[PDB]
Amino acid sequence: THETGTTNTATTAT
Amino acid sequence: CPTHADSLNNLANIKREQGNIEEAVRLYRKALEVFPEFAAAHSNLASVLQQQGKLQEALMHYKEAIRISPTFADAYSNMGNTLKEMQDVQGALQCYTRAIQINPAFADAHSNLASIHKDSGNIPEAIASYRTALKLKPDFPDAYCNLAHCLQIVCDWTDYDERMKKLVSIVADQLEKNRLPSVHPHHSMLYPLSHGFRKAIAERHGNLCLDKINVLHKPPYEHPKDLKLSDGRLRVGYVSSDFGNHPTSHLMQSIPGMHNPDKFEVFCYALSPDDGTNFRVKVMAEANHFIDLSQIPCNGKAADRIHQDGIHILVNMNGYTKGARNELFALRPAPIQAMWLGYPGTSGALFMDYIITDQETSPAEVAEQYSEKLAYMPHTFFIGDHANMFPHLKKKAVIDFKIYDNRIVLNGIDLKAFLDSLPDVKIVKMLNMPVIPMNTIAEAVIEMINRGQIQITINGFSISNGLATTQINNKAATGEEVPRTIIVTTRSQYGLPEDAIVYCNFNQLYKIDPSTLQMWANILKRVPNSVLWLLRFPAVGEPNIQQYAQNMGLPQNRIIFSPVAPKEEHVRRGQLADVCLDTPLCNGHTTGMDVLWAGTPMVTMPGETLASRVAASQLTCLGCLELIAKNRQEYEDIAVKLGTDLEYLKKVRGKVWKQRISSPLFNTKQYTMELERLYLQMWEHYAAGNKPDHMIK
Ligand SMILES: COc1ccccc1[C@H](NS(=O)(=O)c1ccc2[nH]c(=O)ccc2c1)C(=O)N(CC(=O)O)Cc1cccs1
Numbered sequence: 001t002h003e004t005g006t007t008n009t010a011t012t013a014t
Numbered sequence: 015c016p017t018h019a020d021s022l023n024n025l026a027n028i029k030r031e032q033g034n035i036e037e038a039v040r041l042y043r044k045a046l047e048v049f050p051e052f053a054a055a056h057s058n059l060a061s062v063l064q065q066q067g068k069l070q071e072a073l074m075h076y077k078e079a080i081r082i083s084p085t086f087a088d089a090y091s092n093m094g095n096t097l098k099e100m101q102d103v104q105g106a107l108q109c110y111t112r113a114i115q116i117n118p119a120f121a122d123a124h125s126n127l128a129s130i131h132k133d134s135g136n137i138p139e140a141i142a143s144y145r146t147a148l149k150l151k152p153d154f155p156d157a158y159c160n161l162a163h164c165l166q167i168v169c170d171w172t173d174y175d176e177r178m179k180k181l182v183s184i185v186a187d188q189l190e191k192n193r194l195p196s197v198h199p200h201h202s203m204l205y206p207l208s209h210g211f212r213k214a215i216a217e218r219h220g221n222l223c224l225d226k227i228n229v230l231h232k233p234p235y236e237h238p239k240d241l242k243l244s245d246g247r248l249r250v251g252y253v254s255s256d257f258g259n260h261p262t263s264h265l266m267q268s269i270p271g272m273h274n275p276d277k278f279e280v281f282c283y284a285l286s287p288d289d290g291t292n293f294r295v296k297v298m299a300e301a302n303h304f305i306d307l308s309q310i311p312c313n314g315k316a317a318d319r320i321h322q323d324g325i326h327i328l329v330n331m332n333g334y335t336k337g338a339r340n341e342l343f344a345l346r347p348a349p350i351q352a353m354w355l356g357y358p359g360t361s362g363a364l365f366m367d368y369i370i371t372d373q374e375t376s377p378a379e380v381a382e383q384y385s386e387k388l389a390y391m392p393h394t395f396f397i398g399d400h401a402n403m404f405p406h407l408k409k410k411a412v413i414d415f416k417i418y419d420n421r422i423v424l425n426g427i428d429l430k431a432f433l434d435s436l437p438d439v440k441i442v443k444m445l446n447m448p449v450i451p452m453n454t455i456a457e458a459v460i461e462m463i464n465r466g467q468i469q470i471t472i473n474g475f476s477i478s479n480g481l482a483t484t485q486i487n488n489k490a491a492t493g494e495e496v497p498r499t500i501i502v503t504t505r506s507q508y509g510l511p512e513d514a515i516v517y518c519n520f521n522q523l524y525k526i527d528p529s530t531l532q533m534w535a536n537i538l539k540r541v542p543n544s545v546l547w548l549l550r551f552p553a554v555g556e557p558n559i560q561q562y563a564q565n566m567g568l569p570q571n572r573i574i575f576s577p578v579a580p581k582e583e584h585v586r587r588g589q590l591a592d593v594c595l596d597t598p599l600c601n602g603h604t605t606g607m608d609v610l611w612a613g614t615p616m617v618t619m620p621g622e623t624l625a626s627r628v629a630a631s632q633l634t635c636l637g638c639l640e641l642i643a644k645n646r647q648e649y650e651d652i653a654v655k656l657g658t659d660l661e662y663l664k665k666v667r668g669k670v671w672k673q674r675i676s677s678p679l680f681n682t683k684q685y686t687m688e689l690e691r692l693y694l695q696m697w698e699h700y701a702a703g704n705k706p707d708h709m710i711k
Contacts, residue, residue: 002200002336004129006095007156008061009088009122010027011054013020 019049023058030062033192035225038062053082057089064096067226067313067341072096087116091123098130106130121151128157132164137554140164155184155196163201166524169558174528181205185215194218199334199359203600203625204524209383212623216362217385219334223344223363230314230345235321237349239701243324247279248697251325251348252301254356255285255337259492261604262331262356263293264581268399271300272686278693281323283307283316285332285339292494313341321347327693330366333357340365350696350706353386355395358603358625360384367706368696370689371395374631375624378710383623389692389709393635393678396628397685398607401675403493404585406501407611408675411439411448413456419447419667421512422460423589424477426500432475444668463504475500481507483583491580505590508547508576515544515657518591518614520584520605523548523555525597528562534595535566536650541657546573547591553577588612592663593656598649601629610636611680613671615663617653619643635679638669 026041042059045052060075076093079086094109107130113123128143144161148154162177181197185207188195195215197205202212241247252270256262270280282301287308288294298304303323310316320328320342328348332338335357343351344365352368353361360369362385369376369386372395376388401408406425411433413422426432433439433448440449450456455472462470462477468485469478476499483491483501490497510516517537519526538544550556553575560570579587585608588594594609596602596618602609606629609616620630620642630642643649656663678684695709 001133002198002334002338003098004132004160005156005196005198006098006126006129007122007154008064008092008095010030010061011023011058011086011088012027013023013052013054 016049019045019052019055022048023052023055026055027058030058031193035062035065036228039066051082053079053086053089056082057086057092060089060096061092064092064099065222065225066229068229069096069100085116087113087120087123090116091120091126094123095126098126103130103134119150121147121154121157124150125154125157125160129160132160135552137164137168137552155188159184159196163198163204163524166204167522168552168555169523169526169562171528171558171562178206182207182211185211189214189218194222199362200357203359203623204527209380209622213360213362213383213385216334216360218362220340220344220361220363220365223341223365227313227341227344232314232317232345235317235345235347238324238326239349241326241697244279244326247275247277248693249279249281249324249326250693251281251283251320251323251328252331253283253285253307253320253328253339253342254331255335255339256331256356257282257284257297258286258289258294259291259494260293263297263399264403264493265396265398265604265607266355267293267296268402268682269397269686269689270297272683274687274690275302278690279303281305281320281325283320283342285337291492292489307339307342313339313345317342317345317347326350326697327352329354329370330361331356333359333361350700352389352696355397358600358628359623360386368709370692371624372631373710374620374634375627378708380622381708387706387708389696390711391685391692392688392711394628394631396603396607396632396635396679397682398604398611398680399682400585400607400611401680402682403496404582404611406497407586407589410589411450413450413452413459414440415452415456415460415512417442417449419444419664420516420590420592421505423503424450424459424500425503425586425589427496427498428475429500432473432500435473444664445672459502463502463506469499477502480504480583480586484580491582493581497582501586503586503589508587508590509574510547510590511543511545513543515541515593516547516591517544517593517595517653517657518547518588518609519595519597519602520549520588520609521597521602522551523559525600525602526559527599530597530599531559531562532566533598533646533650535563535568537595537653537657538568538572540650540654544572544657546595548573548575550575550577584608585611588614592667593617593653595653596629598626600625601627603628606632607680610670610674613667613674615641615656615666615670617641617643617649617656619646619649632679636670636677637673638666640666 022045026038030038045055056075056079060072063072079089090109090113094106097105110127125147128140131140147157199216281303307316325348327350354370368389372391411424468482478499478501480503489495588609589612594616598619618629620627
């Protein structure tokens with residue numbers, strides 16, 4: 001059984 | 015001016031979303047040239063480096079971001095995802111819990127934490143954390159879809175209809191927006207998605223492999239155009255993470271050694287280290303060549319090794335499963351690359367030429383479900399090693415506790431020898447079944463079962479309690495060795511009734527949907543006293559199934575659950591059932607082979623997906639077309655007839671018991687010969703200068 005994918009967070013520069 | 019670095023970083027973020035990973039890397043690095051202490055740019059760069067498979071370099075930039083900004087929760091959560099991929103679960107948990115401690119409202123980190131719980135087998139905590147993520151970020155496709163699979167796993171069908179609607183909606187939106195779908199390819203079979211969507215899901219996950227090989231800047235390989243360098247022999251390479259104690263070896267471990275060395279040279283490329291089991295020993299000893307690619311983690315260097323061996327046909331046994339390195343196939347080290355056996359579906363990927371299947375599983379009218387060209391085996395593409403692994407189940411005897419074939423069962427290598435010294439055994443004609451009367455020996459055997467004793471000795475023969483195999487010989491329990499003793503298997507061991515029909519299904523519960531359980535309920539309601547035998551797979555799904563069954567008019571005492579068992583006990587106890595009811599949503603695959611080897615008729619309704627038609631392919635090769643239903647009414651009628659016409663049940667059980675031996679289904683030698691004829695059609699086709707086309711003979 002494959003590992004569950006994850007969500008990378010993109011950071012907005014301000 | 016600070017807008018310079020900020021603008022580069024935010025433009026790179028856009029490029030990443032668009033799939034232009036190379037340009038994103040360039041802009042992130044330019045941002046770091048302009049503003050070296052740029053925490054966000056370090057972390058965003060590490061994100062795309064992770065996506066390119068540069069895991070160690072990504073970690074380094076994550077730590078730089080956190081050194082610059084110790085409370086940068088994005089970087090902690092992103093780093094957790096990289097550690098999870100490196101198999102460092104404790105490191106990943108430490109990062110996720112740090113991120114959530116910094117920012118309790120951080121939806122993404124809650125969802126990434128949930129994925130750890132899901133993979134650990136802690137489905138209630140995964141559900142809680144996914145639900146926290148969706149509460150914080152209501153539009154969150156990864157969390158919704160992985161939550162949906164959590165609920166599938168435990169058979170929680172609350173608002174199942176709206177769940178499927180939204181799953182399909184999410185995939186449509188993601189496909190339309192050129193994003194990676196949040197439904198995984200191996201799961202797409204479970205949901206009412208179109209065949210186009212399932213193929214597109216596959217292609218997009220395959221594209222992930224391209225981002226990881228493109229950074230290698232490798233040119234195309236030159237491929238052999240003849241067999242001269244190999245002495246006229248076709249070089250076949252089997253690539254798999256599962257040469258070991260894994261169901262794929264339980265299916266095909268005999269095939270490498272059965273290839274004809276006068277016309278074939280067999281290379282097995284292991285993606286996993288040696289797990290110490292006899293499965294790994296056997297393939298390493300019987301393949302002409304065995305190559306441990308787990309020692310060569312660079313996919314460019316591993317592909318070079320494949321290409322140096324001169325492989326003509328390279329066989330992908332993983333598809334989208336744990337342990338896959340489809341990057342190897344994306345680099346195309348061989349002129350012909352085929353999907354086979356390990357993955358029930360299309361790769362959707364340009365870099366795979368063929369899928370090895372058959373006309374029952376994959377009839378020509380549905381070729382559009384697959385990106386590959388179809389390559390037909392003559393009977394079924396499925397195969398199992400049961401005849402080699404479980405020969406003790408070729409014969410059985412029973413005790414007449416009063417005559418049934420599946421209430422008290424004995425199997426063993428020396429079973430016939432044992433019975434030679436019991437002069438009062440009766441031989442029943444049904445291929446012959448000996449029947450031990452209720453004598454002194456039988457009482458001692460039954461007493462062993464009732465007292466939970468491990469084994470007894472009668473006339474020098476060891477007689478084992480079938481529930482204690484791991485205490486007697488752990489290698490017998492796993493299928494690594496053939497059991498030596500006579501084994502006793504009984505309905506009482508599993509709480510099954512002695513005087514009623516047992517319908518069984520030994521699949522994971524996520525293969526059941528409401529529609530399937532309703533169909534099973536219709537059957538039980540028509541066969542009085544019959545029961546359904548399912549597995550705690552997992553246990554927390556049991557109250558959900560019991561509750562839904564009761565709402566369908568079925569008392570709780572009609573469904574009996576047993577624990578998951580070691581491999582040999584799981585196949586052996588299939589002999590206690592009268593009938594197996596196959597799951598139409600996704601059939602039993604390995605488990606279909608298992609139940610037929612026990613002689614248990616399996617009723618199935620082939621669907622449209624490859625995964626929904628395997629069991630019928632198996633039953634066609636077996637030669638029991640009367641067990642294959644054209645619709646739900648036929649499926650119920652067949653199952654009810656087997657449970658109510660006991661002479662018919664004896665007839666059909668007799669067919670399975672006999673044809674598991676006489677048909678091609680479990681014949682690995684014939685399978686390997688026909689596999690070889692298919693490889694040679696592929697090779698000749700290529701050798702004549704043609705691109706792949708269907709090989710349907
Ligand atoms: C070594 O087994 C691997 C390895 C990798 C992936 C799947 C399996 C394995 N598939 S298998 O064909 O062998 C197999 C075995 C026992 C079985 N016992 C049953 O009662 C019913 C089915 C069954 C199937 C598996 O499905 N398991 C269940 C899980 O994931 O928790 C793990 C195991 C549990 C007991 C021994 S093994």
